């Protein structure tokens, strides 16, 4: 089994469990590998990062929880690896170039 089949399984590993507290100590242990070694092979298969991409699906989930659900900004961050919305609102100007308040207005 080549490693390009490993990371193909890893793209369906998280697509249901980004609302869960999913950390690297779960992803590495339930893959059969170590904590660091999964990140070296992750570059040569999809050209992007791993610890930011789980945020990139988490910040994708916050936008589809804002354009559909009435949940506030402060405690969507509580389930997605943040302890407050102060940093969680800040990276959204990097990921989608918008404010977490301004997305729901422009339809």
């Amino acid at each position: 089994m080549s490693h390009q089949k490993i990371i193909q399984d890893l793209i369906a590993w998280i697509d249901e469990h980004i609302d869960q507290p999913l950390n690297i100590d779960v992803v590495a242990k339930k893959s059969g590998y170590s904590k660091w070694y999964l990140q070296r092979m992750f570059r040569t298969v999809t050209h992007q990062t791993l610890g930011d991409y789980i945020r990139q699906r988490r910040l994708l989930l916050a936008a589809v929880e804002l354009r559909t659900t009435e949940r506030p900004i402060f405690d969507i961050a509580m389930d997605l690896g943040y302890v407050s919305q102060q940093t969680f609102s800040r990276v959204f100007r990097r990921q989608f170039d918008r404010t977490p308040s301004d997305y729901r207005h422009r339809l």
Binding site: E16, Q20, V26
Partner: protein, 94 residues
């Protein structure tokens, strides 16, 4: 009162999706793509293996306990239950 009560004793009077691949069983995302990597490419091999090591492999997590047991609750299948004839001649992988 036993002397008295002994004087009154004469006066008191085939399933279609069991023969299905796991990835086309209409489940959630990480409930189907983790069975085929442990020689379970059918539904018949999942019901006949011990659960105290199957979820403890480094491919399956904690949230998969429900949906495997969701199939196992309705039709009447048991944990580690043997089957009469699940496997046909056609077996494959991805």
């Amino acid at each position: 009162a036993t002397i008295l009560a002994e004087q009154l004793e004469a006066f008191v009077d085939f399933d279609p999706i069991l023969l299905r691949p796991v990835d086309d069983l209409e489940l959630t995302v990480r409930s189907a793509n983790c069975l085929k990597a442990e020689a379970i490419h059918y539904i018949g091999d999942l019901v006949q293996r011990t659960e105290v090591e199957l979820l403890k492999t480094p491919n399956l997590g904690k949230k998969s306990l429900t949906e495997i047991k969701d199939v196992l609750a309705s039709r009447g299948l048991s944990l580690g239950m043997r089957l009469e004839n699940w496997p046909p001649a056609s077996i494959a992988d991805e």
